[PDB]
Design a protein around this ligand. Structure first.
Ligand code: NAG
Ligand code: NAG
Ligand code: NAG
Ligand code: NAG
Ligand code: NAG
Length: 351
């Protein structure tokens, strides 16, 4: 057939010379072809400017006239594109973002420029791509190429590593309280890589948190309130490109009861010449399960009266006249009594 017939579907490969900033067009043909005015030694058209059309008329002894007129639509310079890692730092442990950047202008129409990627075995067609649900602490090879009129003119590879993902959780051997103001937590460290621990103890109203060293596996909880339930939470964390907290292990205990605080604002007031009215306010810290107010009346370093009520209101009647009395009032929570509030008041009249 005609050379236009034999070479109607001829393909070209573009080879960039970084030193000259010029392209070579390699004609994809077996036989040593002849080119018109312009020479094509071997089967290569040399020194082509980027983004400029060149015409080549192709013939061979095996085909007749007309010659195959081939238009070389030369691509942009390879150094005008850069493969950039756009990965979001908060999601670096499970994601990859890659994007080609156009670092210098070129006159070629961008509508004929296509970008391809292969990450693992997934194939993408776009200027930028995103991979999600990646396993942390792994390495992946993402290959990419750029096409002009579906012809590859450049390519690159990017090897990416995924950051440090979620450690924890630690295992509690036991968390208990053997005292009223103290508690303890015994645990085992998690198998994953971590930087430190976080302990939080929650009571009814307050929540207190602490950062402990990664080396210790026991914590002595000090300065606790008697007869109160504490919900402990222990988790491990790591400082990667962002802080990553692991799962939290939970445990609880109620601290032991203790003697209550002293009763508040105790008063003794005369109701007659031989009778007193004793009243006080509840202790700030009851520290126990039940409620009871006790009154001890002493005279001459000897206990003369011992009364108890649900409320701190005592009417001490029919006492001896002209006698100095000691009034010891205290709360009893059911488990322990409180330190007595001591007041002295003497009776009037004469015996
Ligand atoms: C293009 O891909 C080939 C493998 O297909 C590779 O050998 C070559 O180095 C890549 N080019 C660049 C500049 O990364
Ligand atoms: C744990 O936290 C403290 C601050 O609370 C910090 O000074 C210390 O360096 C951390 N430990 C480790 C091993 O990173
Ligand atoms: C991670 O733990 C720290 C305390 O170590 C806390 O301030 C932060 O809010 C926690 N974040 C999450 C998402 O659990
Ligand atoms: C005790 O009660 C009296 C009378 O109500 C009051 O003036 C005083 O401020 C109270 N003291 C305390 C410590 O609450
Ligand atoms: C007063 O009675 C209480 C309640 O039974 C008792 O615990 C306490 O010992 C008595 N006081 C004295 C000084 O005996």
């Amino acid at each position: 057939p005609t050379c236009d017939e034999k070479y109607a579907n001829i393909t070209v490969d573009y080879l960039y010379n970084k030193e000259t900033k010029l392209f070579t067009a390699k004609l994809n043909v077996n036989e040593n072809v002849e080119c018109g005015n312009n020479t094509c030694t071997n089967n290569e058209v040399h020194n082509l400017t980027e983004c400029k059309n060149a015409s080549v008329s192709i013939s061979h002894n095996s085909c007749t006239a007309p010659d195959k007129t081939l238009i070389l639509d030369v691509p942009p310079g390879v150094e005008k594109f850069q493969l950039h890692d756009c990965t979001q730092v908060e999601k670096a442990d499970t994601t990859i973002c890659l994007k080609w950047k156009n670092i210098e202008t070129f006159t070629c129409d961008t509508q004929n420029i296509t970008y391809r990627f292969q990450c693992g075995n997934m194939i993408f067609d776009n200027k930028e791509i995103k991979l999600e649900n990646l396993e942390p602490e792994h390495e992946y090879k993402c290959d990419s190429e750029i096409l002009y009129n579906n012809h590859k003119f450049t390519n690159a590879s990017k090897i990416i590593k995924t950051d440090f993902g979620s450690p924890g959780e630690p295992q509690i051997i036991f968390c208990r309280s053997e005292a009223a103001h103290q508690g303890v937590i015994t645990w085992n460290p998690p198998q994953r890589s971590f930087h430190n621990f976080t302990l939080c103890y929650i009571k009814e109203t307050e929540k207190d948190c602490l950062n402990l060293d990664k080396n210790l596996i026991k914590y002595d909880l000090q300065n606790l309130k008697p007869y109160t339930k504490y919900v402990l939470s222990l988790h491990a964390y790591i400082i990667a490109k962002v802080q990553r907290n692991g799962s939290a292990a939970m445990c609880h205990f109620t601290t032991k009861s203790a003697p209550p605080s002293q009763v508040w604002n105790m008063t003794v007031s005369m109701t007659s010449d031989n009778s007193m009215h004793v009243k006080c306010r509840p202790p700030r810290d009851r520290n126990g399960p039940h409620e009871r107010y006790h009154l001890e009346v002493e005279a001459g370093n000897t206990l003369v009266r011992n009364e108890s009520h649900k409320n701190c209101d005592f009417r001490v009647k029919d006492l001896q006249y002209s006698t100095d009395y000691t009034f010891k009032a205290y709360f009893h929570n059911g488990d322990y009594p409180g330190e007595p509030f001591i007041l002295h008041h003497s009776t009037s009249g004469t015996k």
